[PDB]
Ligand binder design. Structure first.
Ligand SMILES: N[C@@H](CCC(=O)N[C@@H](CS)C(=O)NCC(=O)O)C(=O)O
Ligand SMILES: N[C@@H](CCC(=O)N[C@@H](CS)C(=O)NCC(=O)O)C(=O)O
Lengths: 203, 203
């Protein structure tokens, strides 16, 4: 199909779709829209945001919903309702970690940012990280089902952005499992080939 | 099946599952766990939080993932991948509105809460509400597909909690469409019967 993907020139919420498209052997226009040019595209999007995936002229918005749809098309969404559920479940936990980190990162008052961070360090982060370590260990380096699923692509796509927001670049020294879903996705030749060819960004 | 649902004695994130179970004609133990007793249940949950749905001893956590699963079991998740996608997409937009309201509501510093609110009033809320009004209008009073789906139950379950966080109890005076998904769910006899029999809470 004619496929076009629209997102900013970063990984953040959109890289997981690019990686999923690479997995599926689906060639696509990687439309990396600069901040300066974005406003001319914004009213053409379903909700006024990116990412947007366009397939034969039909637009799909909302990052996780797009990854789930691509995961289903590429056989990465489990074999029945209960398996599909587990992936949704573990990805929704990942989104809580992202949301908690985002609440610190996007605080523009450096003083309030500082107290929010301290508070999360003692009350949510330790529990999130131990829980993520349990899940990655239970699933042998994967986010769900003990094998490759679309949830590994969501994890791989957002991992650096998460780390940048957590302000622990050194996260995976205490938790070497945290690298494993990325390794699983980058082990896939097509995906490795796309990543080797693609720009790098810090988030 | 033997079904048990565990959540706090409020609607917030868990009411949508109770309503979906009522729709499905699935009798269940509505286990409303008080804050004071919660800690004894917390280590028995998959992630250390509620809601948790237990079916024949197997636990399902993560609210949206549970609603999607129940929606699929009850034929409320569309008829193909593209329809299922649209529901996921529009519910993920709803979650952004919730997340934005939550960032104000859970601010414990009343001064900072005040500036965050003012900032959202001029920069995200007007766009969210117009966009939600468009979606509800396009879909004839529903969150997606122009008909009843599991996304209407998510909306119905969280609507009061959202309003309490937005600090616009008067939301649906400017936007009478905002009441419609609730009307669609409450029009269903089993669901109306459960709601008539169930406790009321302000969120
Ligand atoms: N829930 C949406 C969130 C999308 C979102 O926040 N997009 C941001 C970038 S990561 C954006 O388009 N900002 C531009 C704007 O709002 O004008 C999704 O996951 O796709
Ligand atoms: N992403 C989870 C969030 C669950 C959540 O935040 N649960 C809260 C109540 S709404 C909770 O269990 N708080 C108790 C605690 O953390 O000890 C979901 O949607 O189910």
């Amino acid at each position: 199909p004619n496929v076009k993907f629209y997102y900013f020139p970063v990984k953040a919420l959109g890289e997981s779709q690019r990686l999923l498209l690479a997995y599926g052997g689906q060639e696509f226009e990687d439309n990396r829209i600069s901040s300066e040019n974005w406003p001319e595209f914004k009213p053409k999007t379903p909700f006024g945001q990116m990412p947007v995936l366009e397939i034969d002229g039909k637009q799909y918005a909302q990052s996780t919903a797009i990854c789930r749809y691509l995961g289903r098309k590429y056989g990465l969404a489990g074999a029945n309702d209960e398996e599909a559920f587990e992936i949704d479940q573990n990805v929704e936990f990942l989104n809580d970690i992202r949301a908690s980190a985002a609440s610190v990162h996007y605080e523009k008052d450096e003083a309030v940012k500082a107290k929010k961070k301290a508070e999360l360090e003692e009350t949510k982060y330790p529990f999130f990280f131990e829980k993520l370590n349990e899940i990655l260990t239970k699933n042998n380096g994967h986010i769900a089902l003990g094998k490759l699923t679309w949830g590994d692509f969501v994890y791989a796509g957002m991992y650096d952005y998460l780390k940048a927001m957590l302000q622990k670049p050194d996260l995976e020294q205490k938790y070497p499992a945290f690298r494993k879903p990325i390794e699983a996705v980058l082990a896939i030749p097509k995906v490795k080939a796309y990543v080797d060819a693609a720009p790098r960004t810090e988030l």
